[PDB]
Amino acid sequence: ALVKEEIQAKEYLENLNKELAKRTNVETEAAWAYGSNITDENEKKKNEISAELAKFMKEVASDTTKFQWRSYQSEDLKRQFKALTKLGYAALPEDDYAELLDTLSAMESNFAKVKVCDYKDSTKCDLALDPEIEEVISKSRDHEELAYYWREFYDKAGTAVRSQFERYVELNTKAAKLNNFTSGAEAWLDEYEDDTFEQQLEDIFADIRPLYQQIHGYVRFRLRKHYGDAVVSETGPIPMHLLGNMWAQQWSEIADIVSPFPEKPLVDVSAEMEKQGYTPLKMFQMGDDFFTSMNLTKLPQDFWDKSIIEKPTDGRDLVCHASAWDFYLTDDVRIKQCTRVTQDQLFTVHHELGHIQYFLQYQHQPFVYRTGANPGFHEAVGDVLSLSVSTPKHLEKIGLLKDYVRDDEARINQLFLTALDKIVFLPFAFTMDKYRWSLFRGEVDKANWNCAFWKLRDEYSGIEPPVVRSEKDFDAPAKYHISADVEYLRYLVSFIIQFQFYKSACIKAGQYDPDNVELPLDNCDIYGSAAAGAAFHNMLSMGASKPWPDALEAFNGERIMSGKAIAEYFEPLRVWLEAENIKNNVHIGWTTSNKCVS
Ligand SMILES: *[C@@H]1O[C@H](CO)[C@@H](O[C@@H]2O[C@H](CO)[C@@H](O[C@@H]3O[C@H](CO[C@H]4O[C@H](CO)[C@@H](O)[C@H](O)[C@@H]4O)[C@@H](O)[C@H](O[C@H]4O[C@H](CO[C@@H]5O[C@H](CO)[C@@H](O)[C@H](O)[C@@H]5O)[C@@H](O)[C@H](O)[C@@H]4O)[C@@H]3O)[C@H](O)[C@H]2NC(C)=O)[C@H](O)[C@H]1NC(C)=O
Numbered sequence: 001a002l003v004k005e006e007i008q009a010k011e012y013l014e015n016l017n018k019e020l021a022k023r024t025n026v027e028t029e030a031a032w033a034y035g036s037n038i039t040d041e042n043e044k045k046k047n048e049i050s051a052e053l054a055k056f057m058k059e060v061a062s063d064t065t066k067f068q069w070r071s072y073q074s075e076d077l078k079r080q081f082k083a084l085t086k087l088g089y090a091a092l093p094e095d096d097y098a099e100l101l102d103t104l105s106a107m108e109s110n111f112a113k114v115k116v117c118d119y120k121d122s123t124k125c126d127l128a129l130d131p132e133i134e135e136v137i138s139k140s141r142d143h144e145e146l147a148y149y150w151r152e153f154y155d156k157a158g159t160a161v162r163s164q165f166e167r168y169v170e171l172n173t174k175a176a177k178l179n180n181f182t183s184g185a186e187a188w189l190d191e192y193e194d195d196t197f198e199q200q201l202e203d204i205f206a207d208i209r210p211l212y213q214q215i216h217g218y219v220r221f222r223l224r225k226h227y228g229d230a231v232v233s234e235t236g237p238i239p240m241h242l243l244g245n246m247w248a249q250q251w252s253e254i255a256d257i258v259s260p261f262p263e264k265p266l267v268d269v270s271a272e273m274e275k276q277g278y279t280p281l282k283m284f285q286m287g288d289d290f291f292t293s294m295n296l297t298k299l300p301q302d303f304w305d306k307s308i309i310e311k312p313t314d315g316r317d318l319v320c321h322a323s324a325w326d327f328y329l330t331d332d333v334r335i336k337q338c339t340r341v342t343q344d345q346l347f348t349v350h351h352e353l354g355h356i357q358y359f360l361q362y363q364h365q366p367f368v369y370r371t372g373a374n375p376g377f378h379e380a381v382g383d384v385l386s387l388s389v390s391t392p393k394h395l396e397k398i399g400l401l402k403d404y405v406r407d408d409e410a411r412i413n414q415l416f417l418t419a420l421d422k423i424v425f426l427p428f429a430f431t432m433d434k435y436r437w438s439l440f441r442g443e444v445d446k447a448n449w450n451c452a453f454w455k456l457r458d459e460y461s462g463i464e465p466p467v468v469r470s471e472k473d474f475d476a477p478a479k480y481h482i483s484a485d486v487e488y489l490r491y492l493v494s495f496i497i498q499f500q501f502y503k504s505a506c507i508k509a510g511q512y513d514p515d516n517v518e519l520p521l522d523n524c525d526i527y528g529s530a531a532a533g534a535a536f537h538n539m540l541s542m543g544a545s546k547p548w549p550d551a552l553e554a555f556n557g558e559r560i561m562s563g564k565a566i567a568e569y570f571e572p573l574r575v576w577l578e579a580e581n582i583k584n585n586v587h588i589g590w591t592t593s594n595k596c597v598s
């Protein structure tokens with residue numbers, strides 16, 4: 001009978017979940033040791049534990065076929081069993097999985113070990129991306145210096161791993177097909193449990209795209225005034241090295257030269273943070289304070305004891321891209337961040353702590369449910385907090401923003417500053433996965449892989465390399481997530497839904513009313529709000545126990561991913577910017593780039 005089997009299956013699941021948590025703990029520990037301390041010994045250790053867990057997963061997926069799980073009454077049991085059938089890379093034969101792991105660590109370690117020579121001193125060749133190269137990219141307004149560092153980094157972080165990337169694509173595809181997905185694109189998209197998900201994102205992107213064009217047009221206009229027309233053309237794609245970010249994914253670092261009202265205040269609290277003697281420790285303690293202030297969970301002692309919150313000062317190689325870690329026990333959660341005392345880093349701290357909070361909220365769930373409702377939810381949590389921390393309202397409370405007058409012009413500056421991070425990012429994030437999807441799906445011949453990347457960057461973002469590239473170069477892996485095999489659509493989803501969360505959290509906190517001029521969405525602070533915290537607790541505690549629309553419904557009663565909230569936030573900027581571009585006869589749109597030779 002199926003009644004007796006379903007009872008037996010429940011007990012099978014309870015034990016197996018706990019076993020998976022314990023085995024994953026061991027893998028995570030080895031991955032932590034390697035990430036904190038890159039060596040051949042730690043690489044070998046990390047990959048061997050992974051190979052071992054993969055083998056166990058194979059046995060698990062095989063064992064699910066012994067249960068008539070599709071016949072069960074309990075939606076919960078069926079959901080758990082379905083999650084267990086999904087093997088990912090662990091579906092690969094033993095030798096193929098080991099090869100994939102070796103390729104993956106070859107790419108991640110290459111990225112982490114990149115060092116370039118000083119622009120002014122060909123003798124000093126120990127400049128790493130974080131912090132040395134990024135310091136220049138964010139601060140230099142010498143266009144040739146910027147171009148030098150761009151070329152050096154992309155040559156070393158990108159082109160150097162072409163053959164490894166090729167083999168990774170092959171094995172990623174082989175794995176996907178062994179799970180009966182068409183390609184790795186479909187395997188990734190499966191995490192969103194919605195067969196129209198791509199179309200939904202296309203529709204939302206199409207609605208916000210006109211606002212992006214206006215911001216792009218205005219930024220290009222302002223850059224021409226700064227650099228002159230020899231460096232920036234009116235009608236062409238923006239040379240990306242001028243945008244204050246190695247990947248041009250966010251442009252806030254150049255706000256001081258492109259701000260709507262240069263004579264009015266522009267929020268940049270980095271200097272005040274340094275003046276008040278801020279430390280990484282203080283920044284994390286402040287993040288903790290924000291969460292607990294909303295009646296959410298305090299960081300456990302293991303976090304403080306075991307986290308790495310500063311770049312180590314010995315000679316060691318490590319991964320400095322900020323990350324948050326769930327060790328799948330109780331309260332063993334960690335962050336590794338090479339924290340610097342800057343405004344952007346203060347947001348990053350809150351982003352990472354958002355992951356940590358999610359871990360703590362769902363750690364009581366069975367193992368397979370100890371993850372985000374979808375990957376976008378996990379990325380959105382910290383950013384909702386970061387949105388309110390970024391407000392003049394909050395920054396004045398914590399003494400970081402002084403003598404600030406919030407008039408109509410200062411408001412436009414702040415909205416524009418936010419847009420330089422939030423709207424600009426949308427086409428960037430979309431192209432990261434449109435590119436990899438196209439390779440996974442076999443839609444681009446290997447002969448055309450590099451210019452296929454830049455074609456997308458041109459088409460969607462209207463940016464281009466500072467120098468002519470060709471198929472001799474291979475630029476995609478110069479972005480961390482591409483070298484490290486981390487799906488990127490999560491961030492596009494995050495940047496849309498975080499505004500749904502923020503709007504609703506602000507309304508619940510009595511911080512936003514569309515008919516009250518004193519409560520604008522763009523100055524909402526949710527600090528200290530137990531009502532906003534309740535909504536978070538209701539949603540995050542669910543983990544992946546239910547399909548994501550149910551998790552969204554738990555937060556604010558809605559079930560649909562929508563661009564309404566983000567457009568609402570930026571509406572006063574849209575009205576002003578459209579008018580300003582008309583007033584200044586600003587050219588909108590761009591010609592096709594000449595910077596990638598076929
Ligand atoms: C991805 O898709 C793949 C298909 O493209 C799929 O691979 C298939 O998985 C099937 C398992 O579900 C498997 O089916 C079995 O086939 C056996 C014989 O196949 C041979 O000949 C084929 C050519 O004709 C070759 O291609 C194969 O390589 C094989 O050499 C059968 O002997 C076997 O049967 C037994 O099992 C079924 C079990 O089914 C259920 O059993 C319960 C009993 O508790 C029933 O109550 C229930 O109703 C249901 O029937 C029994 O019914 C039966 O009595 C036998 O005991 C079985 O049909 C198939 O061979 C395999 N390949 C192909 C090419 O079809 C992958 O599994 C998919 N991967 C993932 C991850 O989902």
Ligand SMILES: CC[C@H](C)[C@H](NC(C)=O)C(=O)N[C@@H](Cc1ccc(O)cc1)C(=O)N[C@@H](Cc1ccc(O)cc1)P(=O)(O)O
Pocket residue numbers: 028031321322323324325326327351352355370371372375378379484486
């Ligand atoms: C081997 C441990 C992993 C590093 C970790 N996974 C776990 C279970 O701790 C993990 O994927 N952490 C996510 C944040 C995250 C965590 C879990 C999720 O379900 C979703 C996101 C994280 O740190 N994401 C960062 C990017 C990243 C993502 C994956 C990595 O392996 C390394 C870095 P972020 O978006 O903050 O820049």
Ligand SMILES: *[C@@H]1O[C@H](CO)[C@@H](O)[C@H](O)[C@H]1NC(C)=O
Pocket residue numbers: 037039040041042316
């Ligand atoms: C890094 O790992 C090596 C082994 O490869 C070990 O000897 C060393 O102690 C580690 N360094 C640190 C700082 O933990």
Ligand SMILES: *[C@@H]1O[C@H](CO)[C@@H](O)[C@H](O)[C@H]1NC(C)=O
Pocket residue numbers: 295530
């Ligand atoms: C704190 O959370 C609890 C439940 O976790 C809730 O009942 C309570 O309302 C919250 N605190 C306050 C002051 O509301």
Ligand SMILES: [Zn+2]
Pocket residue numbers: 351352355378379
């Ligand atoms: Zn993240």
